[PDB]
Symmetry: D2
Subunit: 250 residues, 4 copies
């Protein structure tokens, strides 16, 4: 089925996670035609500024996420930043996410693959679509069986990312493809591009959502308001239903 990965960018508090998890659980029950995966980062390890919010740490985060899966029975996904974090994270995370800047770090990929969990690699803004083939190979060599590649834009001049949708069919040759709707534009362009992603064809969409994005401690300018999530999901399912007839074979 279609994958929808969503949740607040960072684990600002297990309290926030529960409120978001409650809504994702509701959509989960409303759209049985979709596999929902709850996402949130226990640490923003690559902020530009040293004086920015990073999080409450790995232990606090894993505990908060554990709570979401127990209170709602939702699959979990979070990102790791160094090899040693794979094991403890794999205790809760159904899908281990690899940050875009780290998509070429062999040991991180191998560490994630060793946990036996699914692995989702964010395509580096510096990577060409065809160069993700080697990323998948690393994961397969490492013992990974469920592999995802996420489109999140490519470097286009300075301080700008462009989404080359030709990447979707190219990456589909060796892995399931997820379109990251919120980081690919980093709000007026979020919906239009997600619509494009599903018209082109992908296996899922990734989107950060927060009750009050403006009050968020991370990606306050791109996180989707929680209340708009249902409408966008219904919209992409309808578009996908009609467009899927034309998705090119492999």
């Amino acid at each position: 089925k279609f994958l929808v990965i969503a949740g607040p960018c960072a684990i600002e508090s297990e309290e926030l996670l529960l409120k978001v998890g409650e809504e994702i659980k509701r959509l989960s029950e409303k759209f049985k035609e979709v596999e929902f995966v709850f996402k949130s980062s226990f640490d923003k390890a690559n902020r530009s500024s040293i004086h920015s919010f990073r999080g409450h740490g790995l232990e606090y985060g894993v505990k908060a996420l554990r709570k979401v899966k127990e209170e709602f029975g939702l699959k979990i996904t979070t990102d790791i930043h160094e090899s040693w974090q794979a094991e403890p994270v794999a205790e809760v995370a159904d899908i281990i996410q690899i940050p875009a800047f780290l998509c070429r770090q062999t040991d991180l990929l191998l560490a994630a693959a060793k946990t036996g969990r699914a692995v989702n690699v964010k395509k580096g803004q510096f990577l060409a679509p065809w160069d993700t083939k080697n990323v998948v190979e690393k994961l397969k060599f490492g013992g990974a069986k469920e592999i995802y590649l996420t489109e999140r834009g490519t470097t286009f001049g300075y301080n700008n990312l462009v989404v080359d949708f030709r990447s979707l069919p190219i990456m589909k040759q060796w892995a399931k493809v997820i379109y990251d709707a919120t980081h690919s534009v980093q709000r007026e362009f979020i919906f239009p591009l997600i619509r494009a992603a599903v018209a082109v064809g992908c296996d899922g969409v990734f989107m950060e959502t927060h009750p009050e994005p403006e009050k968020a401690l991370s990606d306050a300018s791109t996180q989707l308001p929680l209340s708009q999530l249902e409408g966008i999901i219904e919209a992409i399912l309808e578009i996908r239903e009609v467009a899927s007839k034309y998705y090119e074979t492999i």
Copy 2:
């Protein structure tokens, strides 16, 4: 609003080629009555990379060929001009005067097209940012143009490659009707033509531009990008279907 489909052979290889394509476009226009078709073909490829490449048979011959298409099939016509003096003679048959991408900032060319009273469609230069088309529209309005289109055809991305930044569709929509060039946006200065056109209609545009030829392999220009004429019907039906289902979500400008 009636969706616009601009299609035809890239170059006016001969008056016979035009009538063959026009025949099919006319057939499709009767089937897809919700679509406004415009027949396109260039009387001159004035910007080929090589001096040895095919250019055409001249403005005179081309205009006469296009007039035949309009006369024989009752189809609207569009062709591109390369210098100011061509606007007047071309305006005699062209319903929409097209401005080449490299020439989108040539003031006198835009002014020449605008004063003819015909609609003007400007291909967005590969060097131009979406927000910079606002001044292009202002020039045309200044020159008297009342029906203006902006065409997305890709942006320079490294060497010999173009990327389509779909964010340009809603940005340009702020000041003009927007057309998506499905064939030139994948050209490297065919496997991606269809998926990208699906993206264009899902995002939302006012029309699509597609070069089509009975046998692309034998084309005298863009032999690698022109869509086989037999595939045009299927592509149009698909974008109409995608447009309909996505239409309720199109943001208001």
Copy 3:
């Protein structure tokens, strides 16, 4: 010898041209090791805004330039925008310049070549270095013998140009290469990059200069102050003298 093409961006008045021509004449007499070519546009035919200064027209411009060559005996160069302008311009212009956006317009190139004058083509911001080979061929086919290719930057994302200096040695294979120091950065970067151009190796430099750039009716943010021209020329000659030892053969 080394080519130095300079002058005010636009012919704001033959008066301005004479003041600039006076200074270029002085440097001309001071640097016999350099071939100076006076440049100025009779029309800014590609301004973004319709409400911008274009000029005083072709006739006024050709007359003003004619005055510069007669009062100072300096070679002249100006750009054309449509085929019909080549002939009347070739009456004064020693070098006919082709605008960057128009580097692929066959008839314009052929028209310039037909005048028998030298032709300098500004490399389009959209063109790859190796693709200028076809530009030269057009000019040769058209009867041009003295051909120049000018590096003026390449599209790098939106509203930004980057200078890929690998272009200098690539274009040198089929034509003399000129580095445009003022349009490649469109002021703090003008000198550094011209220094780079000569260290890499080129046949000349192009730079717009105006007595009071801020008061200029065009390129007020990039035109080099007239008083700084001598210093930059002396600097590039010194750098070239030392670096030329390492310029790669053809």
Copy 4:
């Protein structure tokens, strides 16, 4: 200020390779007494594209090899770390800890290097704008780094290509000493190595970084970009000459 030349084989293929290169670097250091040389080699290529490519013989072996170079030749040392835990052991031999381009924003890695008391050299990510290195320097200073370098190694330009925006040299100079990577800036993710290094010194930088190997064709990494060791002397003499003549024109930051 004494110009810095960072050079050595890309990877620590063996302790013998290092001593062979170190021998030549030591010879050149005696000749070019106005230059500060730093011997470089990676104990691990932790980011190769293919899982089948050479990585190295481990941190332990590498550090021991580097210590041999410093011990036998009296040369300063630099190598790169890939995860936080490696900073401590590496700091035992490395005078300058290098931060890989893809990892230039990894806060904990930068902090790990900074607290060792050693100098830190951060390769500017191919995705990073020049003005955004200001925060990189702030992180390092926050972490205790007192000697910081920023290395220019190209920027993503379309697919599989890097361009060097020389405007970054004076921009980055505003907050750190700047090094130009002559070999990685022309790599496609050798004919241009020399001309671009001439440009770097003419623009103005504080040092250059060059990978060099006795027989590049037989290298286990960057076989297409590493400079033959016999050409190192000539290149250094040339940049010193160009630097001298251009030096009086270097703008003040």
